[PDB]
Amino acid sequence: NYGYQPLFEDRRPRNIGDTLTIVLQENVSASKSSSANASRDGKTSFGFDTVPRYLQGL
């Protein structure tokens, strides 16, 4: 003799020892990224090609 069993309810596991099907469908995906940058240029110049006489002292 087994216990009371419902009629219209689905067959769910209810006690220790009942079986149940697991459908393994796992799909995980993670990601990350980053960056950084910096830059600097400089260029100076000056040239007195032909100096007049009254400025030759400087």
Place this chain on the structure above:
Amino acid sequence: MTPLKGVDSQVYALAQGNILVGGVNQLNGGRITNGAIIERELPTQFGAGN
């Protein structure tokens, strides 16, 4: 021949016979007189105690 189960899914009676439909009236439902025979008995505590 049809077995009649309880709520514990055990056979308590066996049913077989001719159906009597009224013949508005219901056509998809009938009743059979003395159509089942008891096969299992239930225990009881009648007669025990005061």
